[PDB]
Symmetry: C2
Subunit: 304 residues, 2 copies
């Protein structure tokens, strides 16, 4: 085997995607049981985004204002409401394809799979990470709002992201499935922009462990470093400060390889200060930061 960035199989989420139309505005909605969740801004025109009064805008709306379509079938909306930045449409049919699921709010650095959708039709799936600056570097075109991000564990789909907008830098912002935005972003037009971003140290470290697991270990050394000394270095390279909590999160990988985290940090320190000298790690020339400690375990163990 080799080591590739992988997305979770997307079947369980494909079965939950529908198209939600309100006037001339169409986007994607997630259908679980008899509820369809979508970005509340589906009830907005152009000039509306410039600080719309969603409360007021919603009143002017009625169940028939919403056109929900699953496959080539219209789902009759029998109720509607707002939950933070999401619209909750009650429909007359419980999704027969509803998987076991839960809604979770992901933390910065964590990864998930995104099912890009258009007109309620899945078009592609990719793995990405919630950046330390609370945005995601995704790939979305107009009409992708409502697309969701998720993780799967056994048979349970953990929904963690719903797409709402693109920022001036071309990165993305969205909410958890309770409608609460990740970061300080809002669903209206403002001068809002992504703050400065950093490299996800925890993930880089997890990735170095995966490399060692796969026999790529030329970068290892016989030294170690203190947490504080590691951070004086990492931060110079725009790496996120490493916490004792991150150290503990890496415990299982540290135990599997018998390489203490601070010993691996000493290796990382050397790599940042001197580069790779033309060599590669897992066939890469750069330090990857979109694999969590959990991702490496999952993959380096063939979890299905």
């Amino acid at each position: 085997s080799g080591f590739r960035k992988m997305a979770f199989p997307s079947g369980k989420v494909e079965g939950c995607m529908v198209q939600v139309t309100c006037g001339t505005t169409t986007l994607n909605g997630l259908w679980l049981d008899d509820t369809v969740y979508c970005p509340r801004h589906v009830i907005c025109t152009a000039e509306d985004m410039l600080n719309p009064n969603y409360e007021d805008l919603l009143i002017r709306k009625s169940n028939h204002s919403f056109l929900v379509q699953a496959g080539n079938v219209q789902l009759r909306v029998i109720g509607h409401s707002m939950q933070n930045c999401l619209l909750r449409l009650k429909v007359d049919t419980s999704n027969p394809k509803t998987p076991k699921y839960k809604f979770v709010r992901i933390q910065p650095g964590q990864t998930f799979s995104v099912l890009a959708c258009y007109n309620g039709s899945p078009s592609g799936v990719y793995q990405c990470a919630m950046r330390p600056n609370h945005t995601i570097k995704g790939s979305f075109l107009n009409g992708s709002c409502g697309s969701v991000g998720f993780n799967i564990d056994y048979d349970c789909v953990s929904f963690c992201y719903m797409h709402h907008m693109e920022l001036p830098t071309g990165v993305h912002a969205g909410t958890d499935l309770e409608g609460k935005f990740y970061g300080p972003f809002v669903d209206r037009q403002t001068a809002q922009a992504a703050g400065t971003d950093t490299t996800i140290t925890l993930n880089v470290l997890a990735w170095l462990y995966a490399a060692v697991i796969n026999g790529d270990r030329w970068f290892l050394n016989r030294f170690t470093t203190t947490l504080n000394d590691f951070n004086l270095v990492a931060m110079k390279y725009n790496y996120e400060p490493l916490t004792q909590d991150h150290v503990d999160i890496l415990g299982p990988l540290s135990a599997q390889t018998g390489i203490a985290v601070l010993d691996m940090c000493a290796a990382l320190k050397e790599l940042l200060q001197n580069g790779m000298n033309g060599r590669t790690i897992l066939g890469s020339t750069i330090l990857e930061d979109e694999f969590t400690p959990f991702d490496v375990v999952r993959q380096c163990s063939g979890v299905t």
Copy 2:
């Protein structure tokens, strides 16, 4: 905006994955209608793989020598035959989840999605390219044999690859859904090794166009080049020779961006000679060749 190495949604394929066992060997099979397709080497023993005669090994088997399972449920095998390097097992029930599909043989340089499976259960999906040398760089652990590669057009699944083995360098080899190997590889333990490979020039150019569409043009220049002079340079860096057909394929992206194909070639020529100088393109520090012109057009805005 943004650009990711994305795969096709795998749902339509997940509903076709099953487990096939024969003796002590288990691997994945693809269940369509009333037929299950899998690598013929499922019938082989440890020694058998050193110099197996498949016709001779299969004649000694019967329908009941095969254990096909859809999840926890056994599918009764009521027929079996060999087609090139694949085993075709007829089962007594039809797969209600069978999508619209077709079997296609892909050309080197083209891309496809792979649904990595183990014991007939989906593990993950990733996008990759058939290298010019016919191998794929795909991360396949012991037991992934039988996993398939595919592309999806509308609602039609075009299956193009079935995983068979791993080569000494760690890259992978397989067949199309008719059981014909991509490359000169054979299904048995031997000295075979992946051949010389090249960077897929057409794809790198497609990617550079993607970079421009996403509003990034630092690598562009005021130069142009002839196809000939470009190949004289690219080939020095282990790039596949570029043909006029390739140039023509890039026509639409060329038109969309206003950048002439030969002009983009000049940019690429400069990048190969000068390197990136600490800069990146679409967040990458190296030139990527796993996105075809079709992929770029599909993922990028119009």
